[PDB]
Every structure is written in C-alpha cells, then in structure tokens.
Amino acid sequence: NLDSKVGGNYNYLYRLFRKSNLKPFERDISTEIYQAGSTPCNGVKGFN
C-alpha cells in the first residue's frame, strides 16, 4: 500500500546474476554489467 507504484517500482534494485555466490554478511553494490552465464562476454550485455 506504500512502496508499490503504478507500472512497477524501479527505485529498488536486485542483482539476478553474479559470477559467484556471496557469503553471509557480505555486500556487493556493483551495478555494472558482469558475466551472467558460463561464457565471459567482456562487459556490455550480449553473447548469450
């Protein structure tokens, strides 16, 4: 009833993919483009 917005609330963010799993009590704030799958794509999104 508060944080929800019409058409989705894009203020908050979440990292779907990362090169490795974070340990408990660890912070990664990096918003850049990194490797998603098993093939390193060298930065900008592409190459599966």
């Binding site: 799958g37 098993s38 093939t39 599966n48």
Partner: protein
C-alpha cells in the same frame, strides 16, 4: 548434415538417448548462421546432462 529435410508440419523427430554429446563443433565452430536458445547457455550444455 542431411541432404533433404521434411516440411514444417511434416517435421521428423529423432530420439537421442544413451549418448555422449559434444557441442563444441555444433556451436563454436562458426559453421551455423545463428542460434536462439533460452534458459541455458550453449557452453553450459556440455557440463549439463
């Protein structure tokens, strides 16, 4: 590599079981025009069974 295929509604299915798959020559060989594959990467299929 078959000479002639079937139609789009006549499509034939070949059962693949009890086999070992090498996907490096089917993808990284750059012998195919394009591929669109969802849910899994082409390199992951070699380490996934």
């Amino acid at each position: 590599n078959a000479t002639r295929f079937a139609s789009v509604y006549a499509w034939n299915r070949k059962r693949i079981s009890n086999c070992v798959a090498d996907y490096s020559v089917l993808y990284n060989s750059a012998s195919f025009s394009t591929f669109k594959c969802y849910g899994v990467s082409p390199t992951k299929l070699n380490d996934l069974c």
